[PDB]
Symmetry: C2
Subunit: 532 residues, 2 copies
């Protein structure tokens, strides 16, 4: 049967699903690890023990335990990111969408969801891989991994809670794909891992980590890179936060043994209820439990690795959205509201700057403020709001990605850069937020092809182009069709640094994406903070 | 006789001079101080002893001893600034242009020449006051003062060479005007002192100094302010430079007494030949012997004085030229040449930055470079050349003047600001230098009214407007005619900060002259250098 597959872990039974008036096979909720529960909480994952009989893979699995956004109850804009399944620590599963008839050896794409390492689900409607699998004829896989304290609590030196276990979950899933995707018609030697935000950072982390490199062929990074200021912490800061977490739950802190034991006795929601209390600074775009530079998963500092070419050399495709910062300002900066234009005063502007660059001394804050202020019109509410939006996006997403791309490109085999600036016609978020963090995802997964979702004809066209770029890149290492007559997406080189815009207008090639600001965030500010 | 005047110092005989087909009286070379020679070198000036008989004031006096620019022998562009009379330490004289018939009590204007405190002459063709005196019907006076070591060698604590004696020369001349201008038809209660560059800084210094304030009514500052980074030094740096000067001439350095005695035995040219060797840094727009914050002429620091309103409160008219820095780059920065377009490489750009801000540490140099670099086109030779031109002008002239104007305006009785951006059609300097430091002077003194000098009709018109603005301001404290139909030069206020352009086009009012850069030079950079 087309829905029956015998893998190395056992047999699996999928289900037939309708898609754009046709059908494809879906294998949902396939386990790739032993349930990380009880004494296994915080530990590295262990391979799923093979099973007898047939595993029923017709329904989505549970979502990993996580903080749930209740800022706007009932609002689709925010609830579309919340878990849509029961939460459980027993959540290490993967999903596979296979074309019909089942291929023999076709290109594979593995999606790694984002969510700031503190949230995320492989089961969201926006991640439904059936459209992409069907349209581009690829085997689409979406994995899952532990988030929050569950996946990143880090007490370096201890083997009970070493940290980075969430990244190891991802790796274990990639290992399963490498070992079993051939039975689903996928080519294990042609897998492209791709992800957004924390997922994009994760992809970059696997490119860097010696232990992950051999498990995939190519990579795509959307709005995220390994070197993002929020993507990782030192073992010292990791340790400090783990201890403070224990302190919030009145745990014995005399030893790692007692802290870890005390934390493993807590219900999941108990850890989640105090998760945010361990941040060192009053900040925005900063998350509690994230990857840690441990000297194991990451041999040395990310910067030294990028400088010496200590990473997988292959082709990469990556980019960012025009307004990455608006989401974080709406949720935590004074002056911003979902239902107002959020025109910002000078007061709130400087308050926002302090929140956006928490690690900066006064001189640093002044440098940022000057860099983003138009002194011929400093009380312009719209300029202050947009200036703040740019600061958050440049510092947290764009400039770090540009640093990565430039460092990677010196040793890589091919780079393709994009700048997504189309605001969906059916967005429910206010206009001031612009092209929001994460909203290019729906175009990548082809939601605009479904009439009932209410996108325009140009947005369907844009979605098909993007899906085809992504899949052709996954297949060949070049998003462009060899003999196409269509406009060509140029290769990003150290010299020209070309990139293209991604919207419904005719392709436009540019150069040096936000260089002016990035030189500020990547060269000057760091120098200033280190000297003062 | 119209050419005979009996002053408190004695009688003077002037001469009749032709001007634009008419005539006026001229009293040239009137002594206002005892010749500061011999044991008087470096000392404060003493009043000129009254004389019997008639002083022949029909010819220009000698020019004070000074360094002479020989960079372009024969070239009018540079030689028009060199002394046009015999040089001599016996040079403290003043000149007066009086309308005919002689007025009874008319507005007086006293010109104070610039020249970086190391050069300058009251006798240059561009300072011929006959045009302004004649056209606007004002009594025009031009004074002189000691420059270089002769006027600013400073060994604080010593009374033999206290410093600031060049400023005291100016003051003594202003004292003579106050005491005697009534005999020439001038109103001693309506005198406006005005000057360019070091002369403008001087004007600002008299506004600040308690001992000078009562000697004039209003002031005009052209391309210069008291707080300019090159206009003054501490008593410590002054002392240090005086000692190094002595060291260049192999003087006994055991005591001030011996140093001063050794210096007074040197011929003038001996001091001038080594004057430039005492600068602390490899620099541009920095001069050896300048005014010193002595606690006497200047009660406290200039900044504390400006902050507490410790200065003469009256009306002021001031402004700058579009390209103040080009002159200094041509003469001392790598890559610039008089006969080439001077397109600058990245190499020479950063070399120029180091030369322009000598006091800056590496972080400071980086801050400047980033502030003036277009990273989307960093190898653009024209952008680098112009960027450097802007740096020199903003740091040395414009931003310091904007700081002064904003601080002064809080306590003053009326401010009028201008931005001179017309490049004379007959300029001999290359095009890349633009609207050069000092080239608004010829329009202020009305040279464009003389056909033989080859200016256009619009430049004659511009000159008349400017002369009329200057003279009407001198007379009333407002450059505008009460019931004129002409376009009005708005008052600069703390709130609106309005200013006008000065060119051959219809008047255009603007606001916040180069605020973006000035906030960098007046608030940020100083904070950076103090913290690091």
């Amino acid at each position: 049967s087309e829905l029956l597959v015998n893998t190395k872990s056992g047999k699996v039974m999928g289900t037939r699903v309708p898609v754009l008036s046709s059908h494809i096979s879906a294998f949902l909720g396939i386990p790739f690890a032993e349930p990380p529960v009880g004494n296994m909480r915080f530990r590295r994952p262990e391979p799923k023990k093979p099973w007898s009989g047939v595993w029923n893979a017709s329904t989505y699995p549970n979502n990993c335990q996580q903080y749930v956004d209740e800022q706007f109850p009932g609002f689709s804009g925010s609830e579309m990111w919340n878990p849509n399944r029961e939460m459980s620590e027993d959540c290490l599963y993967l999903n596979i969408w296979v074309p019909s008839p089942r291929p023999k050896s076709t290109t594979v794409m593995v999606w790694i969801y984002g969510g700031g390492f503190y949230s995320g689900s492989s089961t969201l409607d926006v991640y439904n891989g059936k459209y992409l699998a069907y349209t581009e004829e690829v085997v689409l896989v979406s994995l899952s991994y532990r988030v929050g304290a569950f996946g990143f609590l880090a007490l370096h030196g201890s083997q009970e809670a070493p940290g980075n276990v969430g990244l190891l979950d991802q790796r274990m899933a990639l290992q399963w794909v490498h070992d079993n995707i051939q039975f689903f018609g996928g080519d294990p030697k042609t897998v492209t891992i791709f992800g957004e935000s924390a997922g994009g950072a994760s992809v970059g982390m696997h490119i860097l980590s010696p232990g992950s490199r051999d498990l995939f062929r190519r990579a795509i990074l959307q709005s995220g890179s390994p070197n993002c200021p929020w993507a990782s912490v030192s073992v010292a800061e990791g340790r400090r936060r783990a201890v403070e977490l224990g302190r919030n739950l009145n745990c014995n802190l005399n030893s790692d043994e007692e802290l870890i034991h005390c934390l493993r006795e807590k219900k999941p929601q108990e850890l989640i209820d105090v998760e945010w209390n361990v941040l060192p600074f009053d900040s925005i775009f900063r998350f509690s439990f994230v990857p840690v530079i441990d000297g194991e998963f990451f041999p040395t500092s990310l910067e030294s690795m990028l400088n010496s070419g200590n990473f997988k050399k292959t082709q990469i495709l990556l980019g960012v959205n025009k307004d990455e910062g608006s989401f974080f300002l709406l949720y935590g900066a004074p002056g911003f509201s979902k239902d107002s234009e959020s025109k910002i005063s000078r007061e709130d502007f400087m308050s926002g700057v302090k929140l956006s660059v928490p690690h900066a001394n006064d001189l640093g804050l002044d440098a940022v403020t000057l860099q983003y202020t138009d002194w011929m019109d400093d009380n312009n509410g719209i300029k202050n709001r947009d200036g703040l939006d740019d600061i958050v996006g440049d510092h947290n997403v764009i400039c770090p990605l540009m640093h990565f791309v430039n460092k990677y490109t010196k040793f890589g085999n091919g780079t393709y850069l994009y700048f997504f600036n189309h605001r969906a016609s059916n967005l429910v978020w206010p206009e001031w937020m612009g092209v929001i963090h994460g909203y290019e995802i729906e175009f990548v997964f082809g939601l605009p092809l479904v009439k009932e979702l209410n996108y325009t004809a140009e947005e369907e066209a844009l979605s098909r182009r993007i899906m085809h770029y992504w899949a052709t890149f996954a297949k060949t290492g070049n998003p462009n069709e060899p003999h196409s007559q269509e406009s060509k997406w140029p290769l990003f080189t150290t010299k020209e640094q070309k990139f293209i815009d991604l919207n419904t207008e005719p392709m436009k090639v540019h150069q040096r994406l936000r260089v002016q600001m990035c030189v500020f965030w990547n060269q000057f500010l760091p120098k200033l903070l280190n000297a003062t």
